[PDB]
Design a protein around this ligand. Structure first.
Ligand SMILES: [Mg+2]
Ligand SMILES: [Mg+2]
Ligand SMILES: [Mg+2]
Ligand SMILES: [Mg+2]
Ligand SMILES: [Mg+2]
Ligand SMILES: [Mg+2]
Ligand SMILES: [Mg+2]
Ligand SMILES: [Mg+2]
Ligand SMILES: [Mg+2]
Ligand SMILES: [Mg+2]
Ligand SMILES: [Mg+2]
Ligand SMILES: [Mg+2]
Ligand SMILES: [Mg+2]
Ligand SMILES: [Mg+2]
Ligand SMILES: [Mg+2]
Ligand SMILES: [Mg+2]
Ligand SMILES: [Mg+2]
Ligand SMILES: [Mg+2]
Ligand SMILES: [Mg+2]
Ligand SMILES: [Mg+2]
Ligand SMILES: [Mg+2]
Ligand SMILES: [Mg+2]
Ligand SMILES: [Mg+2]
Ligand SMILES: [Mg+2]
Ligand SMILES: [Mg+2]
Ligand SMILES: [Mg+2]
Ligand SMILES: [Mg+2]
Ligand SMILES: [Mg+2]
Ligand SMILES: [Mg+2]
Ligand SMILES: [Mg+2]
Ligand SMILES: [Mg+2]
Ligand SMILES: [Mg+2]
Ligand SMILES: [Mg+2]
Ligand SMILES: [Mg+2]
Ligand SMILES: [Mg+2]
Ligand SMILES: [Mg+2]
Ligand SMILES: [Mg+2]
Lengths: 206, 51, 124, 97, 113, 152, 243
RNA sequence: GCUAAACCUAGCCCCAAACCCACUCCACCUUACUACCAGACAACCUUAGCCAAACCAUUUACCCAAAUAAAGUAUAGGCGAUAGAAAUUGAAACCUGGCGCAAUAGAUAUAGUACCGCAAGGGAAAGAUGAAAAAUUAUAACCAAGCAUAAUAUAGCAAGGACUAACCCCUAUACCUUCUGCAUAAUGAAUUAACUAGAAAUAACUUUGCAAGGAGAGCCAAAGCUAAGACCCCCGAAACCAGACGAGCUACCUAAGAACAGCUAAAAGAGCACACCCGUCUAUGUAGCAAAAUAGUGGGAAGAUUUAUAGGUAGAGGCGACAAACCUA
RNA sequence: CCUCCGCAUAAGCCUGCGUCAGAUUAAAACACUGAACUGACAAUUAACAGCCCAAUAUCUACAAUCAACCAACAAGUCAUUAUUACCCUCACUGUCAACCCAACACAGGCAUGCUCAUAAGGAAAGGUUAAAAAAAGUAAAAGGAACUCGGCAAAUCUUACCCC
RNA sequence: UCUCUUACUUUUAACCAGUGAAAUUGACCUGCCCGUGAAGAGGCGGGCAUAACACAGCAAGACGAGAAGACCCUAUGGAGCU
């Protein structure tokens, strides 16, 4: 879960902890770094779940939904559009099951699309005076919403039931704390009725 | 006098994306036929207009 | 030669070196004239385990619980929620006297009691 | 084998750079600025050689004179040894004495 | 392992509980004695001339007749000052290399974009 | 507790008490045959026999009759690709003997699984793979290599 | 690369950086005094200029001192401004003979002294030069109070000086009760002295002693936050009530 | 067609600017990385030598104030190699670069790691796809030595003149260095790739500028002065000195241990003779099993014996039943 | 068939022929699969051995050698008492291996106890042939040092003299 | 030991299989006699000889390999000792 990557490590469409990534980039590997455009956290507009337009490539002018975002290489994978074909089930006597597989796209290769007219548009991050902070289109001036995407938790909160080891909301939020000038040790000692009468004595710290 | 060989390679694909991922492989086709169309046994004999 | 990089442990020296090094366990007594080890009951950490029969708090939480803005507890917040109401009441009543802060929870010296805070008498 | 098998990437040069287009400007500033400034004062570089050409032994001696008090210890040891060696070479060795 | 993330969840939950207990204890100690670092210590300067934070060790006899303690030397004997300067210069060299490399990388990035 | 400073005990002083212990132990399956009352644990280095006995009888209420301990040396033989030795951690194992005649056999956790629920993320692609394999294995030696695709 | 400051300025930079920067100003100035000691083992030039032989030309001359070496026995005792001379000689005072490393040591004597300000008898390892200096100064007290640090060349002498200066500044019951007029007479024998009390403490203190004194001066164990918070809250309550 | 070849970029260098660092918990001066006990010892000190003087014996730049100039002047000095001031003068606050290197280069550095050494200490090597490897596809080949495809043909520095023909015919004593003189049987070299060796003044010469004046203060000047160009190598001792590190080998010693069968026992620094210590002679070995061994044969084997452990003496020294012995091959 | 070995302890070393998988590759001086290996998993459990002791005074002439006669010199390896203080107890560490020092899976070096040929532990020959030269042995007619610098070596058991 | 050597065994050896070094090497299409010549020739002159190519031996030559001769001399090069 906590693995540190080498200073010049290639992000390669597979998670760093994956077996395929371990095969591709063993610790012995050293290769020339790919240099990417520096983009801050406050101007990256396209998020995982919105519809983008491919400006050029093998298919130019077709609309698609991003399925994965790799911020370490300015990559957005569009669902089944900028694809090349490969086999997955491989044996020494029979191989087949040719599938389409997407190739990553740089962020200049795609543009955001607004739901009114379904056209490519540029986005500027205009800070709303209501408190929240969202994107705004340039040509027409609409609020393009952050798309709803399933979270990385792999769960849906509405169809969630408490397990035998999950504490319920009521007794997990019920406030039993009363602030006091006593330590946890004193509180547990007195609560469990442990009587200590002999005193701790002077000790030399140095 | 201390050097070995390298390039341990495996030449078989596997099912590693379903092992852990938040994106899926986007398919374009199906496995077989929803229901096989049985042709008439005497289709060659009935290759005319109609009977 | 000898292994400089390996960590020096209790398995490595002669017979005298073995048994003197140790592995980090804390002593619970002393050695007497006949090499007999005297254990001290008070030097052995006694585990303070509570009762969990009627305890309704599981080691996990429900996802239906709602988030909250974090706020690390500070000495100012603890004072405000611990002594401020009582001292406000006994100042409004006019009984607050600045000399004796003891009855508000303060104590001048920390030597007198058993769990002293600055030198950290207790264990954990 | 010594030659590369491919042609090196084509190296484009912008001749109308800011620096290339403004090169030489404010030279002759003493000649046609009433000699308030010398062209040698337009030079940027080390403190011990601005407006000064010098030999290699001369350069080492000047560097140790002007900036050798705030030098690193190993660098100053190297400078002292270099000055010693250069003294010996330029004063005892070679043709033409 | 069936669901390894359970171990991580438990570990971080206990870490949060320890954080909460430590925060309450720290606030109480600050309120009552105005101190942090509930282990007493002192800024000292060891035999190699470095500045260390020496933590105390709760002995039973005073330090002036503690025989083992009086064998440690918390002072310089300044044959170490040249080594101190050499370490300082090594640190300066490493820092200068780092800054220069940052400059070069920025220049390359701007050169392309 | 571990990685903590113990208060120094002085004669006549209070009892040393730990309220939130820092010791975590593993109940390991023995690699050899052991008596029926012997339970094998893997405990931290700083834990002692008295510590483990009190741990077991205070947290799990397990009656303990005997405790023995030893230190297993982890291997320092594996070399990194840079020829740097990789050290497996040394650990401590404890053999506890139960008190009142109780016996303990290590459970068999992993057997047995029997589940056939509906799936879409991986089972659909498995149905893909299986159906393609079952439909595309119709080669014929009588043909000698000519592709069996064209109707002609 | 290069250091921002030359290596010989580093001591001054440390002096203005930390607790040395919090040391008292007069002590710091006395530390930075850098005044030259009187010639002892060499004869000074009488004049800045001198007309030399071999040409009737006036040439500027400067007197350079000898690097005399002081063993710690000197710090324990009261020598003059003189110590060990670690030099070299030629075999028969001719430069074409061997060069031999020579050491010249002072002739030391053990003698007893009385301090009128301290009212105490000290035994010190002394030499003829400082005996003569005491004779010229008319008393050990006068010699110690008149001679500067660059000339006493002894931590013992500087400690004696600080003791007498503190005695004079305090005007304390020096001799004993029942002799107030004798005490006053001894005090008035040295009116041209007695710098202020807070200044006489830092006299004859090395840098380490000064830093240690200043560190024990600012010990000031921390005050509980309880007092600060209660004071703030009561001031807030008074402010809100008076409105 | 194998082995191979090729590649840019990790980083580095020199400047400028700016004064820079360091307690999460625990452990760490004892045998460091060790939870817990009664003699409290303590640092302050002129480098030397190589080298130059063509030997060497006084002497021989090297030190920590911005520049420049006075000036290489006054002075010093086996008055000689060389050493060398000062008075005085005056020294314009701000700008993020490169006619630097690009994997044998540039830092030793992927690292002070691996490895070597008891220790102080020494100290490496190396990587290259592509947008995507969640594209393993088919291309991309072409290029050093070494080989293979494909051994050989009377005769001869390997070739040249040729010729219808490869050879046969005719002519021809490798190269470098060193020397009076080398085919010399004098040196060096298997071969390929990469790396690998001429640094500067006085005064002259040429080419400009200005000209009894030149020069952007100082300096020179009876055509001079100012500016430029052009110009003086690489590897190698045995040595000497300073400061550390070494007595786990060995020399001697100190403390506290251990071993010595059997026979003759004269009583024993006695005899035969094991274990054990040593190493007389022979043979083998000589890049060996071994940087001193093996087999046999030998000297001793209750003593001035052998031997385990810990400690001590160290290089201008230690130790020595003096072999100029030994002090980590 | 060999055993001049072996089993323990000390010292040293530090997981270094236990299991499973890869053995397509990789070290095996070749191989099977395991001493010249890769990854994972597993193990050495204290009674043996280390790790000791409250002070202040005071005491301590008579070796050992079956310790008995006898006999020595080099003259030796072991002991308390008096008063005060003191009523808790079984912690911690070593425990594996075919192993250490010699660059090596090196005919070398390596303390002590135990049986001194074993109940331990091991294998000189990859296969063939039967040249020379070489190494190690065995046997040899007649002669018996004629060899050689020299009875070196070998075989037999050996007298007398001289120098130091 | 020798006159005066012989026979056998083991190792080595030679062949087959596996694994697999080092010193050395200007290039070599690398003969003999006489003569010559930096004075001792495979390579030069005059003669003679002469299809090609493995394997086992031997040690006359390749002024054979190894070690920038230790003997001798020289150096205004060292060091130990008296
Ligand atoms: Mg000379
Ligand atoms: Mg010379
Ligand atoms: Mg000489
Ligand atoms: Mg001046
Ligand atoms: Mg490099
Ligand atoms: Mg390097
Ligand atoms: Mg080729
Ligand atoms: Mg011909
Ligand atoms: Mg000659
Ligand atoms: Mg010739
Ligand atoms: Mg030649
Ligand atoms: Mg020669
Ligand atoms: Mg050669
Ligand atoms: Mg010499
Ligand atoms: Mg000498
Ligand atoms: Mg020894
Ligand atoms: Mg004898
Ligand atoms: Mg004998
Ligand atoms: Mg002799
Ligand atoms: Mg001799
Ligand atoms: Mg065992
Ligand atoms: Mg060896
Ligand atoms: Mg057996
Ligand atoms: Mg065999
Ligand atoms: Mg055979
Ligand atoms: Mg054989
Ligand atoms: Mg016979
Ligand atoms: Mg004869
Ligand atoms: Mg004869
Ligand atoms: Mg014989
Ligand atoms: Mg063979
Ligand atoms: Mg001839
Ligand atoms: Mg042959
Ligand atoms: Mg030849
Ligand atoms: Mg030869
Ligand atoms: Mg030579
Ligand atoms: Mg000469």
């Amino acid at each position: 879960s906590k693995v540190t990557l080498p200073p010049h490590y290639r992000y390669g469409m597979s998670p760093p902890g994956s077996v395929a990534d371990k095969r591709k980039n063993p610790p012995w590997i050293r290769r020339r770094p790919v240099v990417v455009e520096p983009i801050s956290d406050e101007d990256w507009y396209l998020f995982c779940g919105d519809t983008v337009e491919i400006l050029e490539g093998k298919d130019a002018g077709k609309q698609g939904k991003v399925v994965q975002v790799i911020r370490q290489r300015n990559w957005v994978v569009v669902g089944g559009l900028n694809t090349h074909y490969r086999y997955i089930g491989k044996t020494m006597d029979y191989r087949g099951t040719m599938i389409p597989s997407e190739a990553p796209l740089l962020h200049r290769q795609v543009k955001l699309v607004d739901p009114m007219d379904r056209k490519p548009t540029e986005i500027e991050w205009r800070f709303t005076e209501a408190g929240e902070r969202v994107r705004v289109s340039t040509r027409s001036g609409r609020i393009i919403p952050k798309p709803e995407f399933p979270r990385a938790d792999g769960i849906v909160p509405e169809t969630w039931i408490d397990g035998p080891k999950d504490t319920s909301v009521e007794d997990a939020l019920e406030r039993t704390y009363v602030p006091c000038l006593k330590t946890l040790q004193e509180e547990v000692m007195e609560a469990m009725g442990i009587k200590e009468t002999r005193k701790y004595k002077k000790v030399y710290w140095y | 006098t201390e050097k070995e060989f390298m390039q341990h390679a495996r030449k078989a694909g596997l099912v590693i994306p379903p092992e852990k991922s938040d994106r899926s492989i986007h398919l374009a086709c199906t496995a077989g036929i929803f229901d096989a169309y049985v042709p008439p046994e005497g289709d060659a004999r009935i290759s005319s207009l109609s009977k | 030669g000898a292994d400089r990089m390996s960590k020096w442990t209790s398995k490595r020296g002669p017979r005298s070196f073995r048994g003197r090094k140790g592995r980090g366990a804390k002593g619970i007594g002393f050695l007497t004239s006949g090499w007999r080890f005297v254990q001290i009951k008070e030097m052995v950490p006694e585990f303070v385990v509570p009762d969990l029969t009627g305890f309704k708090l599981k080691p996990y939480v429900s996802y239906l619980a709602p988030e909250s803005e974090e706020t690390p507890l500070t000495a100012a917040q603890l004072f405000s929620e611990a002594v401020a109401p009582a001292i406000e009441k006994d100042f409004k009543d006019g009984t607050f006297d600045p000399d004796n802060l003891e009855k508000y929870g303060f104590e001048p010296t920390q030597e007198g009691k058993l769990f002293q805070l600055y030198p950290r008498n207790f264990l954990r | 084998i010594g030659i590369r098998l491919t042609l090196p990437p084509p190296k484009v040069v912008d001749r109308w750079n800011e620096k290339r287009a403004m090169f030489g400007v404010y030279d002759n500033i003493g000649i046609l600025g009433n000699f308030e400034k010398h062209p040698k004062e337009l030079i940027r570089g080390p403190i011990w050689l601005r407006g000064w050409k010098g030999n290699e032994l001369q350069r080492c001696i000047r560097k140790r004179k002007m900036v050798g008090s705030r030098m690193f210890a190993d660098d100053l040891h190297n400078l002292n040894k270099r000055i010693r060696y250069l003294y010996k070479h330029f004063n005892r060795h070679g043709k033409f004495r | 392992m069936p669901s390894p993330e359970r171990l991580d969840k438990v570990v971080d939950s206990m870490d949060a509980l320890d954080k909460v207990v430590q925060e309450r204890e720290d606030a109480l100690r600050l309120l009552q004695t105005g101190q942090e670092r509930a282990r007493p210590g002192a800024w000292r300067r060891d035999i190699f001339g470095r500045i260390i934070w020496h933590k105390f060790k709760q002995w039973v006899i005073p330090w002036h007749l503690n025989k083992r303690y009086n064998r440690k030397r918390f002072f310089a004997l300044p044959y170490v000052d040249h080594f101190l300067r050499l370490e300082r210069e090594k640190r300066a060299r490493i820092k200068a290399r780092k800054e220069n490399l940052e400059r070069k990388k920025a220049k390359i990035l701007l050169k392309k974009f | 507790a571990r990685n903590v400073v113990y208060p120094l005990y002085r004669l006549g002083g209070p009892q040393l008490r730990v309220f939130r212990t820092n010791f975590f132990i593993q109940l390991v399956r023995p690699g050899v045959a052991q008596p029926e009352d012997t339970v094998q644990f893997r405990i931290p280095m700083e834990m002692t026999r008295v510590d483990l006995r009190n741990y077991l009888e205070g947290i799990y209420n397990v009656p303990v009759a005997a405790v023995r301990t030893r230190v297993q040396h982890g291997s320092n033989k594996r070399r990194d690709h840079r020829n740097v030795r990789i050290k497996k951690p040394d650990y401590k194992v404890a053999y506890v003997q139960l008190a009142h005649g109780q016996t303990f056999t290590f459970p068999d956790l992993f057997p047995e699984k029997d589940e056939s629920p509906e799936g879409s993320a991986a089972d659909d692609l498995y149905s893909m793979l299986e159906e393609e394999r079952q439909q595309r294995q119709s080669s014929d030696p009588r043909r000698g290599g000519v592709p069996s695709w064209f109707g002609l | 690369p290069l250091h921002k400051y030359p290596v010989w300025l580093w001591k001054r930079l440390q002096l203005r950086e930390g607790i040395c920067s919090r040391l008292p100003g007069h002590y710091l100035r006395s530390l930075e005094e850098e005044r030259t000691p009187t010639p002892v083992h060499y004869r000074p030039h009488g004049a800045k200029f001198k007309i030399n032989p071999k040409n009737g030309q006036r040439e500027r001359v400067e007197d350079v001192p000898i690097p005399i070496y002081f063993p710690p026995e000197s710090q324990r005792g009261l020598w003059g401004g003189e110590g060990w001379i670690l030099g070299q000689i030629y075999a028969n005072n001719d430069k074409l003979s061997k060069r031999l490393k020579k050491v010249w040591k002072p002739q030391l004597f053990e003698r007893e002294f009385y301090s009128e300000i301290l009212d105490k008898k000290f035994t010190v390892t002394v030499t003829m030069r400082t005996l003569d200096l005491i004779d010229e100064a008319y008393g050990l007290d006068f010699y110690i109070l008149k001679t500067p640090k660059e000339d006493l060349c002894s931590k013992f002498g500087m400690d004696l000086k600080r003791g007498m200066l503190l005695r004079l500044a305090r005007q304390d019951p020096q001799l004993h009760p029942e002799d107030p007029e004798r005490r006053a007479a001894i005090y008035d024998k040295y009116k041209e002295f007695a710098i202020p009390e807070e200044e006489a403490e830092w006299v004859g203190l090395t840098l380490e002693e000064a830093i240690e004194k200043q560190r024990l001066l600012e010990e000031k164990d921390p005050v509980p936050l309880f007092k600060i918070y209660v004071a703030e809250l009561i001031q807030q309550l008074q402010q809100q009530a008076l409105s």
